[PDB]
Every structure is written in C-alpha cells, then in structure tokens.
Design an enzyme around this catalytic site. Structure first.
Site, PDB file in Angstrom:
ATOM      1  N   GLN A 166       0.847  -1.180   0.000  1.00 32.53           N
ATOM      2  CA  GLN A 166       0.000   0.000   0.000  1.00 32.53           C
ATOM      3  C   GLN A 166       0.893   1.244   0.000  1.00 32.53           C
ATOM      4  O   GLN A 166       1.879   1.322   0.738  1.00 32.53           O
ATOM      5  CB  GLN A 166      -0.938  -0.014   1.206  1.00 32.53           C
ATOM      6  CG  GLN A 166      -2.277   0.651   0.913  1.00 32.53           C
ATOM      7  CD  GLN A 166      -2.450   1.963   1.638  1.00 32.53           C
ATOM      8  OE1 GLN A 166      -1.539   2.792   1.674  1.00 32.53           O
ATOM      9  NE2 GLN A 166      -3.629   2.167   2.216  1.00 32.53           N
ATOM     10  N   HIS A 199      -2.235  -3.744  -0.010  1.00 36.57           N
ATOM     11  CA  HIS A 199      -3.407  -3.052  -0.527  1.00 36.57           C
ATOM     12  C   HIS A 199      -4.322  -4.084  -1.177  1.00 36.57           C
ATOM     13  O   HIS A 199      -3.868  -4.903  -1.976  1.00 36.57           O
ATOM     14  CB  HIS A 199      -2.960  -2.027  -1.571  1.00 36.57           C
ATOM     15  CG  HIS A 199      -3.978  -0.966  -1.862  1.00 36.57           C
ATOM     16  ND1 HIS A 199      -3.734   0.071  -2.735  1.00 36.57           N
ATOM     17  CD2 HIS A 199      -5.223  -0.761  -1.370  1.00 36.57           C
ATOM     18  CE1 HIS A 199      -4.785   0.872  -2.767  1.00 36.57           C
ATOM     19  NE2 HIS A 199      -5.702   0.389  -1.948  1.00 36.57           N
ATOM     20  N   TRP A 233     -10.970  -2.723   8.028  1.00 33.95           N
ATOM     21  CA  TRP A 233     -10.801  -2.444   6.610  1.00 33.95           C
ATOM     22  C   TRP A 233     -11.309  -3.559   5.711  1.00 33.95           C
ATOM     23  O   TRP A 233     -10.750  -3.846   4.655  1.00 33.95           O
ATOM     24  CB  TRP A 233      -9.342  -2.093   6.301  1.00 33.95           C
ATOM     25  CG  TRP A 233      -8.930  -0.837   7.007  1.00 33.95           C
ATOM     26  CD1 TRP A 233      -7.978  -0.715   7.974  1.00 33.95           C
ATOM     27  CD2 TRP A 233      -9.509   0.466   6.845  1.00 33.95           C
ATOM     28  NE1 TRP A 233      -7.929   0.582   8.428  1.00 33.95           N
ATOM     29  CE2 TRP A 233      -8.858   1.327   7.752  1.00 33.95           C
ATOM     30  CE3 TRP A 233     -10.519   0.987   6.024  1.00 33.95           C
ATOM     31  CZ2 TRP A 233      -9.181   2.687   7.863  1.00 33.95           C
ATOM     32  CZ3 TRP A 233     -10.841   2.339   6.133  1.00 33.95           C
ATOM     33  CH2 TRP A 233     -10.171   3.172   7.047  1.00 33.95           C
ATOM     34  N   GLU A 236      -9.692  -6.029   2.970  1.00 36.35           N
ATOM     35  CA  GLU A 236      -8.271  -5.728   3.071  1.00 36.35           C
ATOM     36  C   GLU A 236      -7.685  -6.250   4.378  1.00 36.35           C
ATOM     37  O   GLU A 236      -6.551  -6.727   4.411  1.00 36.35           O
ATOM     38  CB  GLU A 236      -8.039  -4.223   2.975  1.00 36.35           C
ATOM     39  CG  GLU A 236      -6.582  -3.827   2.844  1.00 36.35           C
ATOM     40  CD  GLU A 236      -6.429  -2.348   2.554  1.00 36.35           C
ATOM     41  OE1 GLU A 236      -6.466  -1.543   3.508  1.00 36.35           O
ATOM     42  OE2 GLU A 236      -6.293  -1.990   1.365  1.00 36.35           O
ATOM     43  N   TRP A 275      -4.377   5.875  -8.020  1.00 35.01           N
ATOM     44  CA  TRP A 275      -5.706   5.870  -7.415  1.00 35.01           C
ATOM     45  C   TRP A 275      -6.578   6.966  -8.024  1.00 35.01           C
ATOM     46  O   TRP A 275      -6.077   8.017  -8.411  1.00 35.01           O
ATOM     47  CB  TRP A 275      -5.615   6.179  -5.925  1.00 35.01           C
ATOM     48  CG  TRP A 275      -4.773   5.286  -5.086  1.00 35.01           C
ATOM     49  CD1 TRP A 275      -3.823   4.400  -5.499  1.00 35.01           C
ATOM     50  CD2 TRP A 275      -4.788   5.225  -3.660  1.00 35.01           C
ATOM     51  NE1 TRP A 275      -3.246   3.787  -4.414  1.00 35.01           N
ATOM     52  CE2 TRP A 275      -3.821   4.275  -3.270  1.00 35.01           C
ATOM     53  CE3 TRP A 275      -5.529   5.886  -2.670  1.00 35.01           C
ATOM     54  CZ2 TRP A 275      -3.573   3.965  -1.928  1.00 35.01           C
ATOM     55  CZ3 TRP A 275      -5.284   5.580  -1.337  1.00 35.01           C
ATOM     56  CH2 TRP A 275      -4.311   4.624  -0.979  1.00 35.01           C
ATOM     57  N   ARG A 284     -21.182   5.849  -3.163  1.00 36.80           N
ATOM     58  CA  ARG A 284     -21.634   4.980  -2.073  1.00 36.80           C
ATOM     59  C   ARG A 284     -22.987   5.457  -1.549  1.00 36.80           C
ATOM     60  O   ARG A 284     -23.260   6.655  -1.538  1.00 36.80           O
ATOM     61  CB  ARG A 284     -20.600   4.955  -0.947  1.00 36.80           C
ATOM     62  CG  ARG A 284     -19.310   4.251  -1.342  1.00 36.80           C
ATOM     63  CD  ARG A 284     -18.309   4.251  -0.208  1.00 36.80           C
ATOM     64  NE  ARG A 284     -17.131   3.457  -0.532  1.00 36.80           N
ATOM     65  CZ  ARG A 284     -16.101   3.284   0.290  1.00 36.80           C
ATOM     66  NH1 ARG A 284     -16.108   3.850   1.493  1.00 36.80           N
ATOM     67  NH2 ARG A 284     -15.063   2.551  -0.092  1.00 36.80           N
TER      68      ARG A 284
HETATM   69  O1  LIG Z   1     -20.570   0.342  -4.086  1.00 36.06           O
HETATM   70  C1  LIG Z   1     -19.529  -0.246  -4.385  1.00 36.06           C
HETATM   71  C2  LIG Z   1     -18.424  -0.560  -3.510  1.00 36.06           C
HETATM   72  C3  LIG Z   1     -17.352  -1.215  -4.015  1.00 36.06           C
HETATM   73  N1  LIG Z   1     -17.240  -1.618  -5.372  1.00 36.06           N
HETATM   74  C4  LIG Z   1     -16.025  -2.348  -5.881  1.00 36.06           C
HETATM   75  O2  LIG Z   1     -15.191  -2.774  -4.778  1.00 36.06           O
HETATM   76  C5  LIG Z   1     -13.893  -2.103  -4.809  1.00 36.06           C
HETATM   77  C6  LIG Z   1     -13.531  -1.706  -3.335  1.00 36.06           C
HETATM   78  O3  LIG Z   1     -14.109  -0.436  -3.086  1.00 36.06           O
HETATM   79  P1  LIG Z   1     -13.526   1.018  -2.996  1.00 36.06           P
HETATM   80  O4  LIG Z   1     -12.694   1.228  -4.196  1.00 36.06           O
HETATM   81  O5  LIG Z   1     -14.707   1.939  -2.786  1.00 36.06           O
HETATM   82  O6  LIG Z   1     -12.583   0.938  -1.720  1.00 36.06           O
HETATM   83  P2  LIG Z   1     -11.476   2.016  -1.255  1.00 36.06           P
HETATM   84  O7  LIG Z   1     -10.210   1.711  -2.194  1.00 36.06           O
HETATM   85  O8  LIG Z   1     -11.844   3.407  -1.627  1.00 36.06           O
HETATM   86  O9  LIG Z   1     -11.220   1.672   0.154  1.00 36.06           O
HETATM   87  C7  LIG Z   1     -14.127  -0.930  -5.775  1.00 36.06           C
HETATM   88  O10 LIG Z   1     -12.927  -0.551  -6.471  1.00 36.06           O
HETATM   89  C8  LIG Z   1     -15.099  -1.533  -6.795  1.00 36.06           C
HETATM   90  O11 LIG Z   1     -14.483  -2.372  -7.766  1.00 36.06           O
HETATM   91  C9  LIG Z   1     -18.283  -1.335  -6.263  1.00 36.06           C
HETATM   92  O12 LIG Z   1     -18.249  -1.658  -7.462  1.00 36.06           O
HETATM   93  N2  LIG Z   1     -19.373  -0.666  -5.728  1.00 36.06           N
END
Ligand SMILES: O=c1ccn([C@@H]2O[C@H](COP(=O)(O)OP(=O)(O)O)[C@@H](O)[C@H]2O)c(=O)[nH]1
Ligand SMILES: [Mn+2]
Length: 287
Positions: A166, A199, A233, A236, A275, A284
């Site tokens: 990460q 990550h 998390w 993760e 990112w 969300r």
């Molecule tokens: O409502 C949601 C939440 C998660 N994801 C998928 O699950 C991964 C993990 O979520 P996110 O990227 O929101 O996690 P963060 O990296 O911001 O902690 C995302 O990249 C998406 O591929 C999605 O498609 N819809």
C-alpha cells in the site's frame, strides 16, 4: 524454469526493500528485465486474466477509464482477458479493445451495503475461477475499479501469489499498520507481528493460488459475520491476515498502485497505476 537472477536485479534500487526475509522479490522500477520475461512467457503462450467489479455508480465513474487504461498498459504483447462484473449490463461501457485483448462481462447481484459489495468479491471471484478462469488463463489479477493504469504493468508482476504494497504505509513499521487489532475477528493480527501492509486494490497469482486467497478470506468474512464483528478495513484486513500466514511469492512496490495525494517522492520513479480521487458522497449509498 525461470530463475530470479534471470530477470530481477535488487542492486538497481539499493535505497528500498527489494527482498523479503523469506526471499520473494519486491518489484521496483529498474529492478526488472521485461525483455527477458516477455520472451520467456511468449514461448509458453501464457494468457493473463483480470477481474474487475463495478456495482452502482462506480460503473459510470470508473469502469470506462479503468478498462481503457488496462487495454493500453496491462500485459502488452500477451493474450489478456478482462472479466467484468457489473450489476447492470445495460450501463456497460463497451470500448474498442486492441490486439491481444478480449473480455466477456457477467451480471451479478448488488449487495445492499458497499462494505458487502467490496467483500462479496472474494466469493464471486472464487466461483468464477472454478467455473472458467482456471481453464482460460495462467495468471490472474483481481483489481479495484477506482484506479487507472499510467504505464506498462507487465509480466514482471506475474507469480504464484502476488501482493501489492500500500502506497501510504510502505515505509512504516508493522505496529503502525492499520491491521485489524481485535482478537474477536478472523482478520486479527497482534501487535509485534506482520511483514508489510498490503493493498486489497491489487492482488493475484495463479488461478489455484488466487482461489485459495479468495477462499479463506471469504471464510474469515463469514466467520466475523457469525460473531457479529466486521473487520476495520473489510476484505483488506482479511487479505493482510492471509498474506501474513501465507507469504506471497512476489510483492509489487507502491509504483504499481500509487496515491498522488502523497505527491511524488524520490522512491516512486515510474507510476504504473494511480488511485482515482475518492467520491464516496456519490458512488456509495450507506455509511
Ligand atoms: O458500491 C460499491 C463498492 C465497491 N465496489 C467495488 O469494490 C472495490 C472496493 O471499493 P472502494 O474502491 O470503494 O474501496 P477504497 O479503495 O476506496 O477503500 C471498488 O474498487 C469496486 O471495484 C463497487 O463496485 N461498488
Ligand atoms: Mn479502491
């Protein structure tokens, strides 16, 4: 039989960690000889797979850019298959793919909580590995959709089991890592333990190994649900527990999944992936 010395030169990057205590190389820009690897894998006619989920507004916000960048930078020169998992196929952005790229797309059930959407990926990936991916590719990577390829992400990243360092914690000590610290959780990692903070946005390996990663992680996710607890998390936390118990045979430096909000320090020489800015208020629907 490929040998580490054949393509990996840790001395090219003496200022960073390039080898773990259990060996396993940490791939940094400058340490890999992609030419050697491309020739080697081409003669084996390998095929690399890549799974990506996009549920809800993540589709409109990130899928097209992820797919477009992957088409241009992911395992160029080798057969690749993109496995797209969305909850609404009618919103699937169909981009033109280039030489050696192809895809298929599946409709999946959208979980109510975004936390479960992210976590249920472990279950779904496993089901697809057994159903077809194991018969279609030699190596598979599973990625978050909220990121974009910036440069060549090639064969130098392939291996039995591959983890991603990460970007925000690669220089920290284990006791600083945001591992799940509650013993009631299956993802629990006590202070005094831990190698790195991985990550969950990127991980992979052979179909067999990824199947075991996703299985186990999902089992831990289900266990916690039965004990009315949810890892800090989510997937993760569980992934890090898995990689603690089952060391990855290869680790990618933060150059392979970088957070520009940090800026661009000396160690990050060439960014292969970055990112996307977070947009939780829109993408969300629950806290
Ligand atoms: O409502 C949601 C939440 C998660 N994801 C998928 O699950 C991964 C993990 O979520 P996110 O990227 O929101 O996690 P963060 O990296 O911001 O902690 C995302 O990249 C998406 O591929 C999605 O498609 N819809
Ligand atoms: Mn993400």
């Amino acid at each position: 039989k490929l040998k580490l010395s054949d393509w990996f030169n840790p001395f090219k990057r003496p200022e960073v960690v390039t080898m773990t205590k259990w060996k396993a190389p940490v791939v940094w820009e400058g340490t890999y000889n992609r030419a050697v690897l491309d020739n080697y894998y081409a003669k084996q006619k390998i095929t690399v797979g890549l799974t990506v989920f996009a549920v809800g507004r993540y589709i409109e916000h990130y899928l097209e850019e992820f797919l477009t960048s992957a088409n241009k930078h992911f395992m160029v020169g080798h057969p690749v298959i993109f496995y797209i998992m969305v909850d609404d196929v009618s919103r699937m952005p169909l981009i033109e793919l280039g030489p050696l790229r192809s895809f298929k797309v599946f409709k999946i059930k959208p979980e109510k909580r975004w936390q479960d959407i992210s976590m249920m990926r472990m279950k779904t990936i496993g089901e697809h590995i057994v159903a077809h991916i194991q018969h279609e590719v030699d190596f598979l990577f599973c990625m978050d959709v909220d990121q974009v390829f910036q440069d060549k992400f090639g064969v130098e990243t392939l291996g039995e089991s591959v983890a991603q360092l990460q970007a925000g914690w690669y220089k920290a000590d284990p006791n600083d890592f945001t591992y799940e610290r509650r013993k009631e959780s299956a993802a629990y990692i006590p202070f005094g333990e831990g190698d790195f903070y991985y990550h969950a946005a990127i991980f992979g390996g052979t179909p067999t190994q990824v199947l075991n990663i996703t299985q186990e992680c999902f089992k831990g996710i289900l266990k916690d649900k039965k004990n009315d607890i949810e890892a800090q998390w989510h997937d993760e936390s569980h992934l890090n527990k898995y990689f603690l118990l089952n060391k990855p045979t290869k680790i990618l430096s933060p150059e392979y999944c970088w957070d520009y909000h940090i800026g661009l320090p000396a160690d990050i020489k060439l960014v292969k992936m970055s990112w996307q800015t977070k947009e939780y208020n829109v993408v969300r629907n629950n806290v």
